[PDB]
Amino acid sequence: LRPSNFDGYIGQESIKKNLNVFIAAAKKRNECLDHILFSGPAGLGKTTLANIISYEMSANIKTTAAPMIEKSGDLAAILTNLSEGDILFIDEIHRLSPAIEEVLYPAMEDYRLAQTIKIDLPKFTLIGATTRAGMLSNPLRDRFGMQFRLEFYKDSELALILQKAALKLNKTCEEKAALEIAKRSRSTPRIALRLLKRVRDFADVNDEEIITEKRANEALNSLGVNELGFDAMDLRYLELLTAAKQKPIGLASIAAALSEDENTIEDVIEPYLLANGYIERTAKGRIASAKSYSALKLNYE
Amino acid sequence: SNFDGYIGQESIKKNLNVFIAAAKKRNECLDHILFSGPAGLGKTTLANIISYEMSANIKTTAAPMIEKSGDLAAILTNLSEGDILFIDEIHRLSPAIEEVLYPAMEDYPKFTLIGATTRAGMLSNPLRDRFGMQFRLEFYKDSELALILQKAALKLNKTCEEKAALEIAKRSRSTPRIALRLLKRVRDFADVNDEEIITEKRANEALNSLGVNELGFDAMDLRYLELLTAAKQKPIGLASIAAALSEDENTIEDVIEPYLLANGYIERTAKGRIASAKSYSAL
Numbered sequence A: 001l002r003p004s005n006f007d008g009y010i011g012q013e014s015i016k017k018n019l020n021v022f023i024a025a026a027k028k029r030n031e032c033l034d035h036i037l038f039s040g041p042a043g044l045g046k047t048t049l050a051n052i053i054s055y056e057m058s059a060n061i062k063t064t065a066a067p068m069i070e071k072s073g074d075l076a077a078i079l080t081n082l083s084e085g086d087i088l089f090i091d092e093i094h095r096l097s098p099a100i101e102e103v104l105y106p107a108m109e110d111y112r113l114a115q116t117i118k119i120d121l122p123k124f125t126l127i128g129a130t131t132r133a134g135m136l137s138n139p140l141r142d143r144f145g146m147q148f149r150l151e152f153y154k155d156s157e158l159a160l161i162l163q164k165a166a167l168k169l170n171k172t173c174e175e176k177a178a179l180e181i182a183k184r185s186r187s188t189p190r191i192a193l194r195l196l197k198r199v200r201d202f203a204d205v206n207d208e209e210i211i212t213e214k215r216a217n218e219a220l221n222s223l224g225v226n227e228l229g230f231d232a233m234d235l236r237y238l239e240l241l242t243a244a245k246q247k248p249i250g251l252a253s254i255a256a257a258l259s260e261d262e263n264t265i266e267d268v269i270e271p272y273l274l275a276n277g278y279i280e281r282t283a284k285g286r287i288a289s290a291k292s293y294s295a296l297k298l299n300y301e
Numbered sequence B: 001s002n003f004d005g006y007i008g009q010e011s012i013k014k015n016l017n018v019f020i021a022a023a024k025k026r027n028e029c030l031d032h033i034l035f036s037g038p039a040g041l042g043k044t045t046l047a048n049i050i051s052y053e054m055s056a057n058i059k060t061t062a063a064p065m066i067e068k069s070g071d072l073a074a075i076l077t078n079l080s081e082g083d084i085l086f087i088d089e090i091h092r093l094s095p096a097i098e099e100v101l102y103p104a105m106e107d108y109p110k111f112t113l114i115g116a117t118t119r120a121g122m123l124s125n126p127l128r129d130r131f132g133m134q135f136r137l138e139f140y141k142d143s144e145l146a147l148i149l150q151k152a153a154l155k156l157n158k159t160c161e162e163k164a165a166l167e168i169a170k171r172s173r174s175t176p177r178i179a180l181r182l183l184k185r186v187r188d189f190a191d192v193n194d195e196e197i198i199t200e201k202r203a204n205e206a207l208n209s210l211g212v213n214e215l216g217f218d219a220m221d222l223r224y225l226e227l228l229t230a231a232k233q234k235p236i237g238l239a240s241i242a243a244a245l246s247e248d249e250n251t252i253e254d255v256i257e258p259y260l261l262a263n264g265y266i267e268r269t270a271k272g273r274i275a276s277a278k279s280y281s282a283l
Ligand SMILES: Nc1ncnc2c1ncn2[C@@H]1O[C@H](COP(=O)(O)OP(=O)(O)O)[C@@H](O)[C@H]1O
Pocket: A001, A002, A003, A009, A010, A011, A012, A041, A042, A043, A044, A045, A046, A047, A048, A049, A161, A189, A190, A193
């Protein structure tokens, strides 16, 4: 119950505009698209886009995950069982063992991969998805003709997503209700769609089909969903920088303080904060903007 | 490809022509070679050219594909005195497999080993010193990429204006693979408009739509330059730079600076690094 095409795909204007151009070209050229790479925080709709592309390209799609692959031959086998034009979608692609990753390079670039060698290749489209762009090797990303980084969603964009999704659940989510759920969804369709199913449940027990703002708030507060959508980690990060004065803190310190991986801070914890203008990456470390100070004060009132 | 109309790597080409001549002049195959440099600059291409010049077979493999002994022993046994063995990510080998390689390279069926690595400073002196020839591929000049792009464009049935090739060159971080990749994206913008001639206007539209940096910089390349520029040319050492960018030193010299040096954005001096005059002009 996710969008099936671009016809009414919400958000990612930039990615959509470009995919539309490359999709026209490939078809005009009577060929399949070059390899595509999607990167960005979980639940932003990259698995979705992958399947939309399969529909737009009237091509079949096969899915798998990096950890799911282990034996080098296994991958070689996967390639062997693909019809000319198909799409191969690998999620968490950044977790491929150098060995497997080494077998993939020639498959993408050339379409060919006792003693023995041989083995040609049908000619397909490899779509890779990662939530850890920083962990992706240059030899691998530089082989994707197309590279797209999903951005977070505006509250107005989530609103629409909720309104349409609500409809499929046989419910009318008023605008003001959509905006309030979005407000606590941390600009992420998955969280918002999750909260929607909870608000619905309150509507059901009250024999209601129209989710109002008032009832949305009832549900959200009753569940204790943070009013601003912050995680425990968002609060810890902002408190760490806000605790320090307008003096930048580098990963070395931050990572050390939050006893967390240095890469997890850049590609998982910070993306949302930077997106909503809570922090900035200065020339020598990070700093918290006015948003943070006023946001935190507001959260603890 | 075979050196005839080869673009770039002037010095490597110059030196290889001499060694290939001397080698053949004495009916022998080249000694072991080591190609060093960031990904996508042309190590594999050069290896193939050598295979053609020496008119010999070439077998490709990588360190991670050689797990434990049995793997390596099998590859060498299936060689043929004069053949060429190309091993990628060679600095990724274990001391055990690395130990089994030292002898074969020196003791031996005379063959030629070509090692490739993107981390020269990551490779050990003992192994490095056993490759008769050592070459550090260098980044390409705008004009060189432009010409390369124009040639690829022809194969893609399209004429690429000089200004259009340079623009792409500029944002392709002086790297053939990136350049080529961006060319195909621009080809698409051309197709949609029924254009056979890739113009600068169309190029910008594409590069900008995709959000490719104007100078092909990373988030790192910018902080690094902001760090050095702010220093008003008072030399800074690695230790300081390593801390400020929360980055490992080898990555700075081995992966980040190489490109910045090549395009004259920074300078290496006895007392440290400084932002060049060229970086004070552009923003
Ligand atoms: N742009 C979008 N428009 C509508 N729904 C979206 C959009 N992006 C994501 N979603 C929804 O959010 C959920 C998570 O999407 P998914 O593609 O699984 O994200 P990811 O692949 O990043 O984990 C899905 O139910 C999907 O329908």
